[PDB]
Structure formats: structure tokens, C-alpha cells
Design an enzyme around this catalytic site. Structure first.
Site, short mmCIF file in Angstrom:
data_model
loop_
_atom_site.label_atom_id
_atom_site.label_comp_id
_atom_site.label_asym_id
_atom_site.label_seq_id
_atom_site.Cartn_x
_atom_site.Cartn_y
_atom_site.Cartn_z
N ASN A 228 -18.79 -3.33 -14.20
CA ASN A 228 -18.41 -2.37 -15.11
C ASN A 228 -19.51 -1.77 -15.87
OD1 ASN A 228 -16.15 -3.79 -14.08
ND2 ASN A 228 -15.49 -4.14 -15.97
N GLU A 254 -19.34 23.65 -13.99
CA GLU A 254 -20.56 23.69 -12.97
C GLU A 254 -20.66 22.44 -12.07
OE1 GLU A 254 -24.09 25.15 -15.96
OE2 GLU A 254 -22.22 24.64 -16.86
N1 LIG Z 1 -15.49 -3.51 -10.12
C1 LIG Z 1 -14.46 -4.20 -10.67
N2 LIG Z 1 -13.17 -4.36 -9.86
C2 LIG Z 1 -12.07 -4.83 -10.81
C3 LIG Z 1 -12.25 -5.08 -11.97
N3 LIG Z 1 -11.17 -5.92 -12.37
C4 LIG Z 1 -10.14 -5.67 -11.23
N4 LIG Z 1 -11.14 -5.05 -10.01
C5 LIG Z 1 -10.38 -4.78 -8.74
O1 LIG Z 1 -8.86 -4.59 -8.89
C6 LIG Z 1 -8.40 -5.16 -7.60
C7 LIG Z 1 -6.96 -5.61 -7.92
O2 LIG Z 1 -6.49 -4.91 -9.05
P1 LIG Z 1 -5.35 -5.64 -9.95
O3 LIG Z 1 -6.23 -6.79 -10.52
O4 LIG Z 1 -4.00 -5.87 -9.16
O5 LIG Z 1 -5.08 -4.73 -11.49
P2 LIG Z 1 -4.18 -3.59 -11.09
O6 LIG Z 1 -4.57 -2.49 -10.36
O7 LIG Z 1 -3.80 -3.12 -12.62
O8 LIG Z 1 -2.68 -4.37 -10.72
P3 LIG Z 1 -1.89 -5.30 -11.33
O9 LIG Z 1 -2.38 -6.79 -11.15
O10 LIG Z 1 -0.46 -5.23 -10.89
O11 LIG Z 1 -1.94 -4.90 -12.87
C8 LIG Z 1 -9.27 -6.16 -6.99
O12 LIG Z 1 -9.46 -6.00 -5.88
C9 LIG Z 1 -10.42 -6.21 -7.91
O13 LIG Z 1 -11.85 -6.00 -7.02
C10 LIG Z 1 -13.29 -5.03 -12.70
O14 LIG Z 1 -13.55 -5.41 -13.84
N5 LIG Z 1 -14.54 -4.44 -12.13
#
Ligand SMILES: Nc1nc2c(ncn2[C@@H]2O[C@H](COP(=O)(O)OP(=O)(O)OP(=O)(O)O)[C@@H](O)[C@H]2O)c(=O)[nH]1
Ligand SMILES: CC(=O)O[C@H]1C(=O)[C@@]2(C)[C@H]([C@H](OC(=O)c3ccccc3)[C@]3(O)C[C@H](OC(=O)[C@H](O)[C@@H](NC(=O)c4ccccc4)c4ccccc4)C(C)=C1C3(C)C)[C@]1(OC(C)=O)CO[C@@H]1C[C@@H]2O
Ligand SMILES: Nc1nc2c(ncn2[C@@H]2O[C@H](COP(=O)(O)OP(=O)(O)O)[C@@H](O)[C@H]2O)c(=O)[nH]1
Ligand SMILES: [Mg+2]
Lengths: 441, 408, 429
Positions: A228, A254
């Protein structure tokens, strides 16, 4: 005024927003409670710049942001953490039940009765904006709220506003690593949103950033807080020109005009060159040439692909710090000399350059070392098609046997939409294959 | 078999004057041949020519056993499709009729409807009864409760059934063959009829009049001695002439659940099953005389849930979708059960009530057939595409060279 | 907010419920009186997932005890955590089933199901938004199997859209203490497949093997088996009550674990588990937890995964750890043991992470597996069933309560079909 509105959808959105707003608060000298000592100390300037903050009567500064999770466990940490007094209480939790990694739930059945509140908050934020505009939507494919609710939100935004840039920062699925089994369905069903309504979409991969952390910063066991932070650095580099003075400024218009050749081609790749640890911050000059060369290495990319397998169609280099145009021009000449970097014939120039005086800021506890100059490269290349094709294969392996389809079908979604989404993806992939062909006389 | 498949039948409704003036015949649908259809989206001035990300033509080819255009009349349509099947039913075999469609598709006109332009239902009923004319038992003495078993009636039970049917007919009463006889004078033919529905995966009867606001007709699905499934506690009514059976079905459809949609229209929200069983009892009669079942199933049209996202209807909408999906999978298995492939596959009929009720006919105790009715108007084009994707034998993408705009 | 209503039937269900509520009360810092004497603030953040708040800051769990016959009543109410439960939730009768499914389902339980449904409706109506129900019981018994199946049927009729979760104690092949286990087990398995969203299979032989070979206990009792099952139950829903880097819930686990509606029979497992003297000889790290979870000797189902293929697995980690290590270890497990994973799912492992570990540990992990080898536990039962049904061994007891022979045969067929439905995917394709 030069103003943008940040939307973050889902858990990935909320956490990336936490990192980004930490970085902005440190950049502009804003305390976690919204007060600026520097404004009272100096009595002049707009250090709480309007690009990301709004000033009230008592000197407090409110972010121009709104994020939604459908899952209270994520945003309630914001309501309790150190930045609880910074945000407006309108952080729209409505998570009496989450999307359960289901696109249909986020898009059709539970995404409603929340969209109206989000649109009202966005309208209230936009009415305060007497100047430039552009939305910055952070989210993740592979989830339910990050895919379905993002689709509904962008569908409504494209009608309500229309002629406003809508940049995207998406967490694309990794080629091998994953955290779900129904990821490809959600990822492929987001194609319509990221094609029709988005004006520019940057994709990043967790595997690539893990490799960058392991190799460059010498972190053996990283977590999402580093990913992040890097994404926040990229975003700050993109929007620096709207906030601080520089020799060459690059607005979002741009930025898009010099990088999006055709409307269907708006999926560039991002890179931050001087990613380096404090110990390795020494033993290195970190001049303009070195960082410009490092931007082009396949190993430093933020998506798992190989630009050597494709062709560069446009590049945007955005420099910050002690940089001068002369060395930049020399670096671009040296890059043009190399034959390992291929450029399409229909773009003889193929470079946009922007320079900013403000050097990057260091977050305490972060693993990036203080540096004098930095560059962010945003390049539109056909190699990104690879990152789609692999995913498509996975989708096929689950759709031949109709696995996991009843969950999506029972939440108000026709089966045929699946096929439709796949066809759309195929069309886009074919387009990326056809622009890279050399001209025929 | 001679490559039976499932013998799908596509029917295109003729354009109405009230809709042609609105510029609905945009060339979206046209019959390439009697086995193939081509579907094209309303592009160019019919939609917004601006933007149009790769939607230049969007042409899809679909394969059908037979396609019946608007030129085919009701009697002509019935004769070429169901007459052989009526003959097969009166021989002694069982049969089913799946029917799929959406509002303005005319499925309710195709199967039933106007007395003058008789649909599939009344025409089949008339052929069946005219065929056995003069071979009706004087009184009812036998109930086809189970698909292979019978229940004997005494005089009091017969009188009670007479009172039941009389009360059902008198209430809610308004205004809305023999030559090829199989075996007369040796086997008496008795005809019984039943009508029910699946609704949120709950079974509900329809011959019971509106006894109360609550629909306490949660019929349970049991299995017989041989394991064949059957609905428990279903009412059946003996019929002596075509008008009685037809009127009883009008009463049953009057009881049938209906609900509004996102236009100013109303449509069914249940999978309604109508069954007619013919008992063939020879002079000997023996026990449980031969039984022949002809069934029809009007399936709730799959409808999108975005525009409908208001009220509890959404719930049943989802249920409807799920049921239809399972049905499709079963049909796909039956299209692979063909010796065409050697691997074979298990038919997942247990995953839903509708498939489970029809167990014997995926197992191989009967034969099934499907009809899809389509509205040719452009405004419903997407819906038609979905219907094709539900019912087409095979689909082809011509790849549409004018598509992929933007790029030179 | 997402709330869970808990139901427990029979002696085994009541004892597992008592141990589970002891575990959860210790997790949330609840004394036997009901007051909260904890330290961390996060403990009260989501306490109302399980508890209701009374007047004087006293918390009462949402527990319903179905057939608390006086033999089990006097054990539960007089225990250390007996006063915590609400008295009105103790539904009870006299002259129990007596290892007779017909008595539990038709004769005796039918007279008592109305009170239980009234209490369940009262509890559910008092919630803000219900996630789903939770049942604990044992098949092969009397009131447990029968009235648990009846309650499942009635609850799913009343509340169809919510989650129905069950922790069923299957009858072991060798460790048997009742003669009519096959009949009740077959009928219960027939009833469960049509009316539950996810069901975890527990076998006493597996738990005894864990107690002997892993924990090195010499004289295990039912308390230790209840302890392990309670640890699993707490580990399943950890992310519903605490924050974490990657959250999950019952619905999200279900969507990622049931490719088809009828394939919802899971094998649970827990790590770490080691003897008291051997904990100092091994470092607690994510690879050790993954190795112990995927080992065949740690599963509680008494089925070896090596005889089949993993349709899909889920891992819920608890503790501060790195996401890269978790993802790398799961990918390594998938790649090194590629024979034991279905080809038509590119990625079988679901991962979730919760920040707050258990009270005394540094890291922990809960495993939910879905594999074809589960069919084995049905097949044995079916064999025993036919060995008793070919000659009507004890059939008159069931028919004397008004229950025809056909209901037996139907159940057999359905169970057999389930086995066949699991046999498609064991063959490579
Ligand atoms: N790079 C990065 N990826 C993240 C982070 N938090 C979650 N992910 C990615 O989010 C993906 C899954 O999304 P979710 O945890 O389900 O979150 P969401 O898209 O809001 O879906 P919900 O759980 O239903 O809320 C995973 O494959 C993680 O790799 C993060 O802080 N940094
Ligand atoms: C440090 C030491 O010498 O003892 C530790 C310990 O590390 C050992 C001995 C414990 C111990 O576990 C057992 O002996 C045991 C016996 C039967 C069934 C289950 C466990 C321990 O009892 C278990 C206990 O676990 C906890 O404290 C958890 O919070 C655990 N608690 C309960 O289940 C619980 C039950 C009733 C009342 C209060 C708490 C837990 C686990 C998952 C979810 C919630 C809570 C711990 C760390 C220990 C002892 C005490 C010896 C182990 O178990 C656990 C769950 O940690 C066995 O494998 C681990 C590792 C160790 O061998
Ligand atoms: N795991 C576990 N199983 C138990 C426990 N108590 C009894 N059982 C099992 O439950 C079965 C008997 O079921 P029972 O409790 O009598 O059901 P009921 O008669 O309806 O209450 C036997 O197979 C026992 O092995 C327990 O505390 N833990
Ligand atoms: Mg979430």
C-alpha cells in the site's frame, strides 16, 4: 482550483486509502487531527492544498474522500485508529452483510440501498469543488464489493457527470498466487466497467510488488502495509503536478492525451525506479540516468509481465526532485539507442516528460530511503495482454464444468452474462494484438 | 434413437401493427434456414452510434431442430409438431412439453388461449378425446394417484369427487381421431387431470380454490415402492368432455400466482405443471390398468434483477433463475447421455424440486420436448438472445469483421 | 452486525455446547456469572455476535438446548458455566427417544418441536441482522439425530435465505457404543443433504488418534474431544468477531468451498497441537502450521485425503504474520502434491487472516477440507445398513412408531447417489 475526489471501494480500497492519506498528511504537514501548525506559524500559503483537502472555518482540513466496504470490520478500524478525527463521519459502512466474494451480490442484491447514499455524498463533495475535477477509484478485482459495487458506482457516475476523468487503481489477480477460488469470475465480470466507463486504468499485482520488496528493499517477510505504501508513492507521483510548482507540469488531461492513443486502449503499466533500502541508499549515485534505466527493467515492473515480448506505444515519465531537463533528454536518447526496447512505428516521439521540484517524503516506519530525486514511469504496452490471457484460461477451466455458477445465478444474474464478459475480453485482447503490427504500405 | 436430441422448437410471433409503426422491425432476427437462426443487435441509428465499443454487428448464429416463422398458423403448427406425439401418447407412452418464453413472446397464445385459434393444449385435448370417443367408462372407479399404482373408489368416494368438481367448476365461473382408434370395445379409456406449480422451490396445488389467504398446500415429494418420485396429496379430476378439462385449467390458471414487472404488465412467477393421465383398462382390467401421462410445463421466464430490484420479488426471481439453470444442466447431460460420447455423466436432477419431480424422464422412463417462443421486436433483443442461449442446440460467432472499431 | 443463533441437541450436543461456551467466554473475558472482566478493548467490539446484553452489563449467550433431559440438565446447569445460560432456553421432555430415530422425528420430538421453534423465533427476532444458525448434535443417537433433522427442516422452511451450519458427530466404524447406529445415521444423512449449507463431519476415532499420537495423553476423556471440537468451532468464525488483514465469514467460506449444491461435507482440522513436554523443541512458524494442517493424521474426519482429491480447502490463520509467507506456503503445498487436487479448479485454497490470536498462543490455524475421500465414511455406513436391512434386524421398533419401510430404502438411494456424486471427480479428467 485543481481538485480531485478519491473513492476507495472494498478492503483493498480502504487499506490503500489509509496509506495514501497518511502520505498526503505527512506531505502537507497536516496533523492526524486535521490541524496544521505550519499555517499558523507562517500565516501564508495554501499548504493544505485543495487537491486533496477542504478547509473549514476553524483551520481544520477535511479529506475530499469517501470509501465503502459492505463489511464494518475494515472501516471501523479507521473510526478507532489514529486518524479517527481526520475523516468526516460519512465513511459509509452498510455492512449488515458482505458480498461473500460474489460479483452478483455486490452488483445486484446488496449493492442497492447503499448506492443512493454514496451518490449523495459524492454530490455533496462535488458541489464544494469550484474548479478542476477527476475521480480516483481504488479497488480490487477478485472480490465482491470491489467488483460489483465498483461496477454499479461507475455506471451511475458516467451518467451523472459524464465528462470527467475517472482514473482507476485496481489490484489485478496474480498469475499463481491467490486468496480465493472464485477470483476469475469476478475478475472477468469487471471487464465492462474497466472498459466502457473508465478513462484510464492502472493495474498492479501482488506477486510483482512482493518480488520488488524481496529483491530491492531486502524485506524477507513483507505484508500489505508495504504494498500500500508503494502504491501510495505511485499515486502521489501521478498527482504531484497539481499541487507543487515545477519546470514542466502535467495535468490529468495532458497525462491522458499523450498516453491513450485509441479509446479502447487505456491500460498502462506503472513503475517506480529508485526503490531502495537505507543501507543500499549509499553505494549508489541514484542519478537521472540510473533511475530512468531502472524504470525499463522487466524485473522492476509492478505487474508480472515482460515488455520485451511486446511493443511500447507511449510513455510518460514524471520526475520529482533535483532534476534538470538536460540529463532527462540525454537519458531518453540513451533509451532510444537500445534495441531491447521496441517502439511502435506509428509513434516516433513516444515520450512525455514532466518535472516537479518537490522531492518525495519519507513515512516513518516505512522501508524506502530518503532520496533527492525520483521518477514514475507510466507506459502503455501490449505485454499487458499476457496478464489477461492467463486469467482467461483459468476462467475457462471453471466454466466448462459450470463450477460455482449457481451462487451467481441465484443472486439475480443470467448465466449468459458470463459468456458475454468473456467475449468482451477476447475482443479487447484482439485489439491489443492489432495495434502492435507494423504499418503496411 | 435416430439422433433425437430433445427436438427443440422455436416459434416467432408475427409483428403487430401497434409495434411496427414504432419501428421495431430493425432486421434483428431473420431465418437463415429452417435449422439455423441469426441474431443481430439494434445497431446503427437503432441505438446510439456514438462510442459503440466493438458492437458494430454483434451477430450470433444458433442451431435449432426446426424454426417456425409467423407464416405458420395455430392448426398447422400443432399438426406438424404434436400430432405424432399425441399418437405416441395414445399408443401407451408418456411425454412432456417444456415451454419457455417472455412477455410478448406469445407462449400463452401458442399453448392455450383463444377458442377459435386453438393452441397446443386444446388441440391436443380435442384430438385425444375425439380419438377415444365412444370408449369412456360409464363412471369413475379408479384414481391415477401414482405413476404406476391406482386407488379404488366406492360409490361414496365417487359422489364426493363429483361434489368436489362441481363446487370447483361452479365457483369462479365466467366466459374467459376416432377413425384411428387404438382398440375400441376392448379397452376403456378414462381421463384424469391435475395442475400444480413450483414456487420458491415449494410445491403448491391449484385445483383447490382460494380457501384462505394462506396457501397451505405445501405438497411433499415422496418416492413409491420402486423409488420413482411422486407428489403426495395432489388432487385429480375425472373429465368426460373437452370443455370440462379446458374450463378446469382456466380455473387453475386463475388460481395461479402472478406479479407485476418493471413495465405496466403482469407475468407469472412460478413453474406451472399440468398433467393429463389416461387409464387404459381392458375388459379384464386386472389391477392398476395401463397409465399414459402427458405433461406440460410453463416455465417462468428468466428476467434480469437490476430493473426489478424493488420488493421481495427479487427473492423469487433468483429462485426462478436457479431452477432454470439446473434444468439446463440436466438437458445438457441428456444431450451427452447420447451414445455420441462414451464417457457419459450423472444427471444432477436432485439439485432442484422441478428436476426431481421429472426424474423418470431424465432416467429414461419417458421422452421430453421443448418449445421456445420469441418476440422478434428489437426492444426485447437482449432477452431473445438469452432465450436462444437457454435453448439453442449450438451457437456460433461469425466474428463480425466490422467489429473492433477505434483501431484503424 | 452479523449474529449467530446456536442450537444443541442430545447429550453429545449439550456437552460440546458447554465446552464451546466455556472456550468462547474465556476468549471474550466473561466470568461464569456473566460479567466482563477482560483487558483488551477489542473483546467487546463484536461480543454481540454470540451474546445478548442484559440490564447490569451481564451477557447471556444465544444458546438453545433442544432436549435437555434431566440427566443432561443436571450436568449442564450444575457445571462451572451453568448459570450463564438463560433458564427459559432449556427445552426438555421426559421418556426420550432411546436410540430410535422414529421417536425423535415423528412421535416424541413432534410434540416438543413447537416450543423450540417458539424460542428460536423469539431469539432471531431480537437480532439486528442474522448471519445464520449453528447446530451441534450426534448421528447414531436418538433425540439428537431425529429432532435435529426436524429442527433443521423447520428452520430452513422459516428462514430459507440464512446460513444453516452443522457440526455433526458421525458414527465411527470401530469405536461403536450403539447397535442401531446405521439406521439413524442413514436417515440423518438423507435429511441433512437437502437442508443445510455446510456440514462438518467429526468422528471419535480421529479425535482419539489425535489425543494418543499427537498430544500423547494416556487417559483421554470426552472433555478433550469436546475441547478440540470447540477449538475448531471458535476458529471457523474468528474473522466475524475480530479484525484482520483479510477477512472472511461463513458465507464467504461457503461460496469458496461448495462447487455444487450437494457437495457440502467438510473435514475440519486445527493446528498447532503438541504435547506439553514437546512444545519447547519446535519453533512456531507458518510452515509448521501448514505442514500440520495438511497432514493426514491431523484430520478429525477419519478419512485419508490420499485416497481421494481435494475439491477445495480453506485456511483461516490467527496471529500477526506475513501474507507472502502464507501465499508461498499454500502455493508450495499445491505444487508439490499436485496429485491430490482437482485439475478443473486452478486454485483450490482459500486464505483468511485474523490479527488477534487465541489467549495463550502466538499463531494458530483452522483447516476446512472438501475432498472426495469423505465418501468412504458413507460407504461403510451403507454397508452396515444393508447388512441389517437385508433381514430386518431391528426394523419393528421403527415401524411401531408409524414409519413405513420405504422411508428406509429412499434414504439408502439418496445416500448412494451422494457417494456417486462424489465419485465423478476422483477420476482424473
Ligand atoms: N496489494 C494489496 N492487495 C490487497 C490488500 N487488501 C486486499 N487485497 C487483495 O484483495 C483481494 C480480495 O479482495 P477482498 O479481500 O475480498 O476485498 P473486497 O474486494 O472488498 O471483497 P469483500 O471481501 O467482499 O469486501 C485479495 O486477492 C488481496 O490480494 C492490500 O492491502 N494490498
Ligand atoms: C503453554 C503450555 O504449556 O500449554 C499451552 C500449549 O502450548 C499446549 C500445551 C496446548 C494445550 O492443549 C491441550 O493440552 C489440549 C488438550 C485437549 C484438547 C485440546 C488441547 C493447552 O491445554 C491449551 C491452551 O490453549 C489456549 O490457551 C488457547 O487459547 C485455547 N484455549 C481453549 O481452547 C480453552 C478451553 C477451555 C477453557 C479455556 C480455553 C484456544 C484454542 C483455539 C481457540 C480458542 C481457544 C494452551 C495454549 C496450552 C494448554 C493450556 C496446556 C495445545 O492446545 C492448544 C489449543 O493450544 C496442545 O497443542 C497446543 C500447544 C501446546 O501443546
Ligand atoms: N465427540 C463426542 N461424542 C459423544 C459425546 N457423548 C456421546 N457421544 C457419542 O454420541 C453417540 C450417542 O449419542 P447420544 O448422545 O446418546 O444421542 P441422544 O441419545 O439423542 O442424546 C455415541 O456414538 C457417542 O460416541 C461427547 O462428549 N463427545
Ligand atoms: Mg471484505
Amino acid at each position: 482550483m485543481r481538485e480531485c475526489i478519491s473513492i476507495h471501494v472494498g478492503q483493498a480500497g480502504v487499506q490503500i486509502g489509509n496509506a495514501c492519506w497518511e502520505l498526503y498528511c505527512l506531505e502537507h504537514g497536516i496533523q492526524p487531527d486535521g490541524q496544521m501548525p505550519s499555517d499558523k506559524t507562517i500565516g501564508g500559503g495554501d499548504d493544505s492544498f485543495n487537491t486533496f483537502f477542504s478547509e473549514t472555518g476553524a483551520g481544520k482540513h477535511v479529506p475530499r474522500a469517501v470509501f465503502v466496504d459492505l463489511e464494518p470490520t475494515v472501516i471501523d478500524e479507521v473510526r478507532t485508529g489514529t486518524y479517527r478525527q481526520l475523516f468526516h463521519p460519512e465513511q459509509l459502512i452498510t455492512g449488515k452483510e458482505d458480498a461473500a466474494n460474489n460479483y452478483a451480490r455486490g452488483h445486484y442484491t446488496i449493492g442497492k440501498e447503499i448506492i443512493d447514499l454514496v451518490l449523495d455524498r459524492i454530490r455533496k463533495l462535488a458541489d464544494q469543488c469550484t474548479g478542476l475535477q477527476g475521480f480516483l477509484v481504488f479497488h480490487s478485482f477478485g472480490g465482491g464489493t470491489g467488483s460489483g459495487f465498483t461496477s454499479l458506482l461507475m455506471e451511475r457516475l458516467s451518467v451523472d457527470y459524464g465528462k470527467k476523468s475517472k482514473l482507476e487503481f485496481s489490484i489485478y489477480p496474480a498469475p499463481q498466487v491467490s486468496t480465493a477460488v472464485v477470483e476469475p469470475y469476478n475478475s472477468i465480470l469487471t471487464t465492462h466497467t474497466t472498459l466502457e466507463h473508465s478513462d484510464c486504468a492502472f493495474m498492479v499485482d501482488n506477486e510483482a510488488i512482493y518480488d520488488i520488496c524481496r529483491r530491492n528493499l531486502d524485506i524477507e517477510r513483507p505484508t500489505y502495509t508495504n504494498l500500500n505504501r508503494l502504491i501510495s508513492q505511485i499515486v502521489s507521483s501521478i498527482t504531484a503536478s497539481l499541487r507543487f510548482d515545477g519546470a514542466l507540469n502535467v495535468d490529468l488531461t495532458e497525462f491522458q492525451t499523450n498516453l491513450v492513443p485509441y479509446p479502447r486502449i487505456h491500460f498502462p503499466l506503472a513503475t517506480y525506479a529508485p526503490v531502495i533500502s537505507a543501507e543500499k541508499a549509499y553505494h549508489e549515485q541514484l542519478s537521472v540516468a540510473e533511475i530512468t534505466n531502472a524504470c525499463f527493467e522487466p524485473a522492476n515492473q509492478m505487474v508480472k509481465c515482460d515488455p520485451r515480448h511486446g511493443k511500447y506505444m507511449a510513455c510518460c515519465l514524471l520526475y520529482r526532485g533535483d532534476v534538470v531537463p538536460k540529463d532527462v533528454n540525454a537519458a531518453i536518447a540513451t533509451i532510444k539507442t537500445k534495441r531491447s526496447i521496441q517502439f511502435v512505428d506509428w509513434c516516433p516521439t513516444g515520450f512525455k516528460v514532466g518535472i516537479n521540484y518537490q522531492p518525495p517524503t519519507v513515512v516513518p516506519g516505512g522501508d524506502l530511503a530518503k532520496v533527492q530525486r525520483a521518477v514514475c514511469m507510466l507506459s502503455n504496452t501490449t505485454a499487458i495482454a499476457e496478464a489477461w490471457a492467463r486469467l482467461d484460461h483459468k476462467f475457462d477451466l471453471m466454466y466448462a464444468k459450470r463450477a460455482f455458477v449457481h451462487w451467481y445465478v441465484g443472486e439475480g444474474m443470467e448465466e449468459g452474462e458470463f459468456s458475454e464478459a468473456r467475449e468482451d475480453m477476447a475482443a479487447l485482447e484482439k485489439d491489443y494484438e492489432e495495434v502492435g503490427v507494423d504499418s503496411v504500405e | 434413437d435416430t439422433s433425437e436430441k430433445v427436438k427443440v422448437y422455436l416459434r416467432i410471433r408475427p409483428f403487430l401493427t401497434s409495434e411496427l409503426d414504432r419501428q421495431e422491425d430493425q432486421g434483428c432476427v431473420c431465418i437463415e434456414n429452417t435449422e439455423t437462426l441469426v441474431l443481430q443487435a439494434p445497431k446503427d441509428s437503432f441505438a446510439l452510434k456514438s462510442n459503440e465499443r466493438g458492437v458494430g454487428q454483434a451477430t450470433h448464429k444458433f442451431t435449432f431442430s426446426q424454426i417456425f416463422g409467423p407464416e405458420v398458423g395455430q392448426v398447422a403448427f400443432f399438426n406438424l409438431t404434436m400430432k405424432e406425439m399425441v399418437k405416441d401418447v395414445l399408443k401407451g407412452q408418456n411425454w412432456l412439453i417444456y415451454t419457455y418464453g417472455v412477455t410478448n413472446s406469445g407462449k400463452t397464445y401458442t399453448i392455450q388461449g383463444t377458442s377459435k385459434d386453438a393452441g397446443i393444449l386444446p388441440q391436443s385435448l380435442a384430438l385425444i378425446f375425439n380419438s377415444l370417443q365412444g370408449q369412456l367408462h360409464p363412471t369413475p372407479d379408479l384414481k391415477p394417484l401414482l405413476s404406476n399404482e391406482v386407488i379404488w373408489l366406492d360409490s361414496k368416494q365417487i359422489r364426493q369427487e363429483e361434489m368436489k368438481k362441481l363446487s370447483l367448476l361452479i365457483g369462479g365461473l365466467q366466459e374467459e381421431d376416432t377413425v384411428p382408434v387404438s382398440v375400441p370395445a376392448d379397452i376403456r379409456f378414462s381421463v384424469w387431470i391435475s395442475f400444480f406449480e413450483i414456487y420458491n422451490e415449494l410445491l403448491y396445488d391449484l385445483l383447490e380454490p382460494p380457501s384462505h389467504q394462506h396457501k397451505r398446500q405445501t405438497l411433499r415429494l415422496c418416492e413409491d415402492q420402486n423409488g420413482n418420485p411422486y407428489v403426495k396429496d395432489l388432487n385429480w379430476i375425472h373429465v368426460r368432455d373437452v370443455e370440462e378439462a379446458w374450463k378446469l385449467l382456466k380455473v387453475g390458471r386463475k388460481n395461479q400466482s402472478f406479479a407485476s414487472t418493471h413495465m405496466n404488465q403482469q407475468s407469472s412467477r412460478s413453474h406451472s405443471i399440468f398433467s393429463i393421465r389416461i387409464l387404459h383398462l381392458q375388459g379384464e382390467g386386472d389391477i392398476v390398468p395401463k397409465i399414459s401421462e402427458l405433461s406440460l410445463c410453463d416455465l417462468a421466464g428468466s428476467e434480469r434483477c437490476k430493473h426489478q430490484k424493488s420488493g421481495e420479488r427479487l427473492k423469487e426471481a433468483g429462485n426462478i433463475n436457479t431452477s432454470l439453470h439446473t434444468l439446463g444442466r440436466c438437458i445438457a447431460a441428456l444431450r451427452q447421455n447420447q451414445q455420441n460420447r462414451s464417457k457419459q455423466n450423472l444427471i444432477p436432477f436432485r439439485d432442484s424440486k422441478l428436476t426431481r419431480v421429472f426424474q423418470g424422464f431424465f432416467t429414461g422412463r419417458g421422452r421430453s420436448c421443448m418449445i421456445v417462443n420469441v418476440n422478434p421486436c428489437a426492444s426485447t433483443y437482449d432477452e431473445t438472445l438469452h432465450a436462444a442461449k437457454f435453448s439453442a442446440l449450438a451457437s456460433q460467432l461469425v466474428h463480425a469483421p466490422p467489429v473492433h472499431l477505434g483501431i484503424p | 452486525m452479523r449474529e449467530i443463533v446456536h442450537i444443541q441437541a442430545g447429550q453429545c450436543g449439550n456437552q460440546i455446547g458447554a465446552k464451546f461456551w466455556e472456550v468462547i467466554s474465556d476468549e471474550h473475558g466473561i466470568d461464569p456469572t456473566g460479567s466482563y472482566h477482560g483487558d483488551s478493548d477489542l473483546q467487546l467490539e463484536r461480543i454481540n455476535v454470540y451474546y445478548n446484553e442484559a440490564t447490569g452489563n451481564k451477557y447471556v449467550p444465544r444458546a438453545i438446548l433442544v432436549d435437555l433431559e434431566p440427566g443432561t440438565m443436571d450436568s449442564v446447569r450444575s457445571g462451572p458455566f451453568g448459570q450463564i445460560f438463560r433458564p427459559d432456553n432449556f427445552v426438555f421432555g421426559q421418556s426420550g427417544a432411546g436410540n430410535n430415530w422414529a421417536k425423535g422425528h415423528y412421535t416424541e420430538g413432534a410434540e416438543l418441536v413447537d416450543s423450540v421453534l417458539d424460542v428460536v423465533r423469539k431469539e432471531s427476532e431480537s437480532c439486528d441482522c442474522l448471519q445464520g444458525f449453528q447446530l451441534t448434535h450426534s448421528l447414531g443417537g436418538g433425540t439428537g439425530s431425529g429432532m435435529g433433522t426436524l429442527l433443521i427442516s423447520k428452520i430452513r422452511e422459516e428462514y430459507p435465505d440464512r446460513i444453516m451450519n452443522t457440526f455433526s458427530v458421525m458414527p465411527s466404524p470401530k469405536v461403536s457404543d450403539t447397535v442401531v447406529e446405521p439406521y439413524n445415521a442413514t436417515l440423518s444423512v438423507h435429511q441433512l443433504v437437502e437442508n443445510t449449507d455446510e456440514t462438518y463431519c467429526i468422528d471419535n476415532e480421529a479425535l482419539y488418534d489425535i489425543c494418543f499420537r499427537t498430544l500423547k495423553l494416556t487417559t483421554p476423556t470426552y472433555g478433550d474431544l469436546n475441547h478440540l471440537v470447540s477449538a475448531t468451532m471458535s476458529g471457523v468464525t474468528t474473522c466475524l468477531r475480530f479484525p484482520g488483514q483479510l477477512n472472511a465469514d461463513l458465507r464467504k467460506l461457503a461460496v469458496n468451498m461448495v462447487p455444487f449444491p450437494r457437495l457440502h461435507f467438510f473435514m475440519p482440522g486445527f493446528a498447532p497441537l503438541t504435547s506439553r513436554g514437546s512444545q519447547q523443541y519446535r519453533a512456531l512458524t507458518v510452515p509448521e502450521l501448514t505442514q500440520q494442517m495438511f497432514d493426514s493424521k491431523n484430520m478429525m474426519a477419519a478419512c485419508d485425503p490420499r485416497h481421494g482429491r481435494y475439491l477445495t480447502v480453506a485456511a483461516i490463520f490467527r496471529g500477526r504474520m506475513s501474507m507472502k509467507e502464507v501465499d508461498e506456503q499454500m502455493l508450495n503445498v499445491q505444487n508439490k502434491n499436485s496429485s491430490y487436487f482437482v485439475e478443473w479448479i486452478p486454485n483450490n485454497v482459500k486464505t483468511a487472516v485474523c490479527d488477534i490470536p487465541p489467549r495463550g498462543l502466538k499463531m494458530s490455524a483452522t483447516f476446512i477440507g472438501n475432498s472426495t475421500a469423505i465418501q468412504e465414511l458413507f460407504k461403510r455406513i451403507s454397508e452396515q445398513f444393508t447388512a441389517m436391512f437385508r433381514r430386518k434386524a431391528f426394523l419393528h421398533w421403527y415401524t411401531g412408531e408409524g414409519m413405513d419401510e420405504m422411508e428406509f430404502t429412499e434414504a439408502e438411494s439418496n445416500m448412494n447417489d451422494l457417494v456417486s456424486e462424489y465419485q465423478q471427480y476422483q477420476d482424473a479428467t
